[PDB]
Amino acid sequence: MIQDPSLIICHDVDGAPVRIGAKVKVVPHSEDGTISQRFLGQTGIVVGLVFDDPATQYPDDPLIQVLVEGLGEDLFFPEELELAPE
Incomplete structure (x- = not known):
């Protein structure tokens, strides 16, 4: 089947740890x-942000996940890592 955008991404919802596209x-x-x-x-x-998890979860993960360049991706807590200064 054709890959249709069934889900639509929204801006940063008030009440989040970090912002999408933010480097932590x-x-x-x-x-x-x-x-x-x-x-x-x-x-x-942060590939995914922790937001109101619907009946289909969103955006891509239930929690925030950091993906290293050339490395893999893991799920971390908002109380674990912090938003880089730079």
């Missing part, structure tokens, strides 16, 4: 308990 830095130290040793010391962009 994966914190080295763990705040909750789970952390990525691979990303531990990297910098990626």
